[PDB]
């Protein structure tokens, strides 16, 4: 069915706008919005279709004190959207309380596109973790759309703040938002700034204007992850069947992402599979290993070569991973997109459950604990104190993510007959 996307945060609104630019380049529309007669493709799961010849993308544009949204206005894509949902803090708790006081009218904006379409499948949350304006508010609406509708699917697009230590309040914020993503979202697509910055410094020569480049990298990822849904495949071409294969344990819903062209600014399948398994073509940063991998192909692919290629990785002993179930590596095939200039014809995807990211989590679980011993880096905001007078909800969230780390460490081994 149809999928509604919601973007908040300034960085989130930017990457949502660039994503819709990428899809306007993808789909049979002009940059004004008007249909082009050159075109197979479906424009229904992400675009509301009138006959106003300007098919409006199904995005909910919310903000706090619009600054970059003015720059979103000065563009030729100002005729692509106008659903009139633009409305005028620093912490998780302050942003949570500010989202608390105005919940009725933003939820009326949600109920508007809920009543606008008749079929409903999923909500994509475009959000940055511990981002200030995004944090608190995004966790609040995440709690509310899961509590209000238990029949739909919740997916999130999320980056990870990592700068190798400055914001001293970030481990509290990420800790609480990770609780809310684990208990109020069914699947989370995890990215970080650091690995994409590393790959960007690898391909280009960039130090200062990194943001403008990594946005392009992210948008290529999010378009690629939706090519199987927008163009009709037969495997996991709905969101529900896609997420139903990727979760072996209901606490594990974090998906690793890669992309086989590391630079785009002939091939057989075993080549791109082996290039795919390398950690440098991976976009997300003791024995730590995958539980189950799904890889998705896009290009001119002969069908018998994929069988030989999977046989090749079986013979390589590149499978030095060992979970406790026979749920295995997964191949899928979709077409490369027509209708646009398409360089580097065959390109790959991976969607995998990897426990190396738990190290990333425990770094936050390290940092907050140190600040919890010092008690000088909570910054003592007034709404933060009124919202929780004892600050034991952060301690309870630390307990939940500690159980999450123990369940990860049990999921690494082939011994999960007992709970971890």
């Amino acid at each position: 069915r149809e999928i509604i996307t919601l973007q908040l945060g300034q960085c989130g609104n930017q990457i949502g706008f660039e994503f819709w630019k990428q899809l306007c380049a993808e789909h049979g529309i002009s940059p004004e919005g008007i249909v082009e007669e050159f075109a197979t493709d479906r424009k229904d799961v992400f675009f509301y279709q009138a006959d106003d010849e300007h098919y409006i993308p199904r995005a909910v544009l919310l903000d706090l004190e619009p600054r970059v949204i003015h720059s979103i206005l000065n563009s030729p894509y100002a005729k692509l959207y106008n659903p009139e949902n633009i409305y005028l803090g620093n912490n998780w708790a302050s942003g949570f309380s500010q989202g608390e006081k105005i919940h009725e009218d933003i939820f009326d904006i949600i109920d508007r596109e809920a009543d606008g379409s008749d079929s409903l499948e999923g909500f994509v949350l475009c959000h940055s973790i511990a981002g200030g304006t995004g944090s608190g508010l995004g966790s609040y609406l995440l709690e509310r759309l899961n509590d209000r509708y238990p029949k739909k699917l919740v997916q999130t697009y999320s980056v990870f703040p990592n700068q190798d230590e400055d914001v001293v309040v970030q481990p509290y914020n990420s800790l609480l938002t990770l609780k809310r993503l684990t208990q109020n979202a069914d699947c989370v697509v995890v990215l970080d700034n650091t690995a994409l910055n590393r790959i960007a410094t690898d391909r280009l020569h960039i130090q200062n204007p990194s943001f403008s480049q990594i946005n392009q990298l992210v948008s290529t990822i999010m378009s690629a992850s939706t090519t199987t849904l927008r163009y009709p495949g037969y495997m996991n071409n709905d969101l529900i069947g896609l997420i139903a294969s990727l979760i072996p344990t209901p606490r594990l819903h974090f998906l690793m992402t890669g992309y086989t062209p590391l630079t785009t600014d002939k091939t057989t399948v075993l080549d791109v599979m082996r290039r795919l398994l390398q950690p440098k073509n991976v976009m997300v940063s003791t024995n730590h290993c995958y539980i189950a991998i799904l890889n998705i192909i896009q290009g001119e692919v002969d069908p018998t070569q994929v069988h030989k290629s999977l046989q090749r990785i079986r013979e390589r002993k590149l499978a030095n991973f060992i979970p406790w179930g026979p749920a295995s590596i997964q191949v899928a095939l979709s077409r490369k997109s027509p209708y646009l200039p398409s360089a580097h014809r065959v390109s790959g995807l991976m969607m995998a459950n990897h426990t190396s990211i738990s190290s990333l989590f425990e770094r936050t679980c390290r940092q907050y604990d140190k600040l919890r011993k010092r008690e000088a880096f909570l910054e003592q905001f007034r709404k933060e104190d009124m919202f929780k007078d004892n600050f034991d909800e952060m301690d309870t969230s630390r307990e939940i993510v500690q159980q999450l780390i123990d369940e990860y460490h049990a999921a690494t081994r082939p011994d999960y007959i007992s709970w971890g």
């Binding site: 999977l310 079986r314 499978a319 979970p323 179930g325 026979p326 749920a327 295995s328 590596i329």
Partner: protein, 81 residues
């Protein structure tokens, strides 16, 4: 796989247990006290039995039916089965 009678004669029972399983779990989303746990243990042991029998039957010999085995055996958990 309808002319080859053994693999047919176990995959039909895999299909028979699945309908009972999905009907059984949907009755109680709480704990199972109508002896559904009793049938759950029997069903998982019988499923392991039937799956190992069909794995021996697959191992005519078309490249596709043998080819399916290696996808599930990438992990080598049909290695000890």
């Amino acid at each position: 796989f309808i002319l080859l009678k053994p693999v047919f004669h176990c995959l039909n029972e895999i299909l028979d247990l699945c309908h009972s399983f999905c009907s059984l779990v949907s009755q109680n989303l709480g704990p199972l006290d109508e002896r559904g746990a009793a049938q759950l243990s029997i069903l998982v042991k019988g499923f392991s039995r039937q799956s190992s029998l069909l794995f021996k039957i697959l191992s005519h010999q078309i490249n596709s039916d043998l080819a399916q085995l290696l996808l599930r055996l990438d992990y080598n958990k049909y290695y000890t089965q």
